[PDB]
């Protein structure tokens, strides 16, 4: 729907990812922090191409497409929310219910049949450890816990996190997080010198192509993800090797993290144990546009005792934030921009050449492409 | 010519108009003020996505495309006017006649066999009320009072005004014009309050539409156009309602204004009276291309002589100017810029939900389509 | 493939010419001076659409695509040469030899079937004259000769030069350079003025049409040029008239220039003398992609020895640099970018109207598309 058929028929295997443009529509996407969003101030994002518009009534979020019914303008252009339940667009006065978006009033014409007869489109929203998740799709939500990856909602699992727009398709940054070989650019991180992190340049696979992952359809709550099990055969690589003299050594810190990597539907990577042996990273690439993500980072730490949780919250801040969601993921950052321009035009899907670490990336792209729960298109967008 | 016809076939009811993305050919448009030009030194503009040259010589208005017949270069790059008849190309020389466009001479080939035998296009151009109207069409041009709205002409009318581009297709601002519910947008303005004005929030309508306007197809000159006269048996709203309660009001002024509202081919609207009971309103919505109009205000007043004449131009510059042509309609800038997005793909007309205030406008759309005298394309504009 | 059929089919004898928007394939194109590219510190360009990594090893120029052949990134965005007959991708380590762009280890993977079985698109790299060329093309390079004009590559000839990227596409600078009447824009020039150039406004041409020009296709060397002969059977014009009545002159001067213009496959002009008796201009106009080329601009001077190079480089730097490639030619830079909108669409081919000395330009657009060795597409910059 979203890709010119010619390359669509020349990616087989995984062809409705690489449609899947504009991310997967009937998913939960975290979007921003609880804090960031306060009683009766309103926050407009952008999800899956969409525009909409959050709100905070009685400490319950609502979700209304930010686009009125009469001539399509951003309400959020000039927000006026006349009374608690409502919102009333700024230009001829359509006024909705948050709860339902149900057209309630007009303030310029109170007699309107329109009145009691048109619906603004709603998604649910829901916070879960401290994170606003909409669900971008149609009629009745699943659980939250199908769209996280395992362990997210442990609990005691403390999750810290911060979120950036960052200008890369989604899906180049689902691969730049997955990709067993691309720790090759972290190589020089001050996390890797700082923290004295056991880190290769990458791995020489071992066994054969079902031994390199793990695919999680099996998941009782309905996840479905891959596990990256390269390492579990392969020998690392911590002497890169040009006509057999020795260029480059990997780090030989006592730290060993990343035990475990995988990624689940519909785009959410977990690393465990990362930065540290004592947490989990998990972290979103949310379809903004076909052109932009939040980069939505959190880090999980199991805690007992809310004095566990405040020396966490303290280490996070001092340690953590700076060092490795920046200091480290920046350089994942860079990567995904980097390859914008060869996946631009959708040729890269084609033109690519992959070798055998990748194939991570290829058990994805089909997980993808079989278990997704809708391909958004730009018919979502407009029509 | 110029949308999809996926769509042209989806909006049966006024497809010209929807097709009219660069305006109607074959119409006078004013472009700038007579003040605004003098003796001898040419201005460039755009009109309906055509490059023009304008010039005054001996107190006469002559008009040019700005595109040399040779290389298509813009004349207005560097201007060389070496006789007061003529234009020379700054590029290779030659030479045309502002007064029909022949090619009379080419300084850098005096032999050359193109002279006398090429005609640079030119476009009809008058002055009236101050106001400078291009006719950009092919051959005879009608009185340019076909193309302008009621009194405009009138032996006593003073036209003052002020010019400015906007960044919004030229029907979004004809739309936002004559919409008698988005006078919502103005309940707030300074000149509302200032000048004590009768504004209610929306005029709701009364009755059958086939009376909710009245079409003048008929008039004697051959001017085209829609008043709207939604209330005189409909209804002003001043006590805006969300669920039976008062979260709004209108304006409780003394002066009953925007009495009654019309919109002529090929853009312009006249509000009588505004924004005082002794003037009106006209506007224009000239296309400048796909993306932009002129929006060229102006404001009539009957005047005896001289005298009233300066005194009108006193109050002008310093109250109805700054109050009413900024402070009022400086939101109906914004809001038209608000309409860009919904309608930007042509799609916003396919899947827009009007309700019964736009009668009018529908009126518009279809007289709109009836009686142009052509649809600019951009065959027009290149070849 | 670059330009619709309705156009070509309306330019038959230079249809090619029109479909070579992005330049000629399996040519030599200079792109910076041989200072510009320090020993094992590579600069990275683009040519004829394509992103080039240009290096020194050992003294020597080698060039390789700069696109990684996995996820196509740019190597340039963080260079890593490990060894120095090697570049290593900054992402996954893929490893390429410059001297034949051979896939010659994976410091992430030692063990890939890939190592050995991929090539990275290299092309010849020649130094002349201070001046870097790119044989942009296929298979073996014929020697520079072919591709630079008559003169350049002599002995005694010193080169200095200066290149800036120009906003126009590459064929407008060209037309540009060897339009025998636009020396128009040049009547006001210091250069003409302070150095007494003869210069007329252009050229009655002397009769026949097919005398104007000389066309070479039977060099020692396989060079493809035309020269414009107008000054030879030519009138020159230091009257110019409007309707009879002297309106501009030219320039009276006692130094006679421009004695013999040539324009060279692949666009290379060669104008002597200029801008002094006992100096020649050499300039070329290199497509950087459809909108942008290099302007590459050139001034030979035969030396005998030091104090005369020394002597030059000193009259370079204080007089013709400024006076002549920056105060005289910028008029050019200004005229190219006047024509871009007119043939942006491709429109402006069909639409252009021809007279007498654009008997040269015609007979250029037949040389190139005649003598061309590949139109450079999509397909070798995409896939
Ligand atoms: C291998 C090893 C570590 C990581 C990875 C792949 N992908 C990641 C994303 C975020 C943080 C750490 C990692
Ligand atoms: C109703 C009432 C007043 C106005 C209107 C619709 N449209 C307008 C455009 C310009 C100035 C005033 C008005
Ligand atoms: S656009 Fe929202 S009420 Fe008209
Ligand atoms: S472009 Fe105007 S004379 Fe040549
Ligand atoms: S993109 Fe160059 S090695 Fe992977
Ligand atoms: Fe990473
Ligand atoms: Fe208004
Ligand atoms: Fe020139
Ligand atoms: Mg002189």
Redesign the interface.
């Known amino acids: 729907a979203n890709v010119d058929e010619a390359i669509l028929k020349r990616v087989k295997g995984w062809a409705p990812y690489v449609d899947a443009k504009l991310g997967f529509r009937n998913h939960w996407y975290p979007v921003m922090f609880s804090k960031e969003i306060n009683e009766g101030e309103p926050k407009t994002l952008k999800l899956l191409g969409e525009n909409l518009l959050v709100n905070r009534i009685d400490g319950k979020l609502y979700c209304l497409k930010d686009?009125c019914?009469?001539?399509?303008?951003?309400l959020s252009?000039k927000v006026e929310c006349?009374?608690k339940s409502?919102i009333?667009c700024?230009?001829?006065?359509w006024?909705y219910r948050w709860e339902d978006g149900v057209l309630?009033?007009?303030?310029?014409?109170?007699?309107?049949?329109?009145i009691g007869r048109?619906k603004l489109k709603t998604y649910p929203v829901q916070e879960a450890k401290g994170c606003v998740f909409i669900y971008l799709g149609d009629g009745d939500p699943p659980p939250l816990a199908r769209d996280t990856p395992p362990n997210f909602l442990d609990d005691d699992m403390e999750i810290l996190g911060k979120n950036q727009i960052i200008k890369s398709n989604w899906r180049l940054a689902v691969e730049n997080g997955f990709?067993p070989?691309?720790?090759?650019?972290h190589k020089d991180s001050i996390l890797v010198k700082d923290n004295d992190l056991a880190l290769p340049?990458?791995?020489?696979?071992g066994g054969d192509r079902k031994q390199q992952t793990r695919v999680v359809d099996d998941d009782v709550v309905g996840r479905k993800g891959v596990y990256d099990l390269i390492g579990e055969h392969g020998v690392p690589?911590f002497e890169?090797?040009?006509?057999g003299?020795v260029?480059?050594e990997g780090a030989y810190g006592e730290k060993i993290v990343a035990n475990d990597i995988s990624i689940w539907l519909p785009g959410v990577l977990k690393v465990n144990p990362f930065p540290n042996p004592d947490m989990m990273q998990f972290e979103w690439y949310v379809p903004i546009d076909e052109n932009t993500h939040y980069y939505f980072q959190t880090l999980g730490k199991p805690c007992a005792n809310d004095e566990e949780r405040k020396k966490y919250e303290q280490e996070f801040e001092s340690k953590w934030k700076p060092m490795a969601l920046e200091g480290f993921n920046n350089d994942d950052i860079?990567?995904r921009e980097?390859?914008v321009?060869?996946?631009a035009?959708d040729?890269?899907w084609?033109?690519?050449?992959?070798?055998?670490?990748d194939e991570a990336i290829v058990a994805w792209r089909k997980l993808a492409s079989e278990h997704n729960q809708g391909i958004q298109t730009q018919a979502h967008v407009?029509?």
Chains 1, 2, 3 share one sequence.
């Open positions: 686009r019914l009469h001539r399509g303008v951003q252009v006349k009374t409502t009333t700024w230009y001829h006065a006024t309630c009033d007009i303030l310029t014409n109170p007699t309107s049949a329109q048109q990709d070989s691309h720790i090759y650019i340049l990458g791995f020489a696979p690589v890169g090797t040009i006509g003299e260029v480059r860079w990567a980097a390859m321009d060869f996946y035009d040729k890269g084609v033109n690519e050449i992959l070798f055998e670490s407009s029509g």
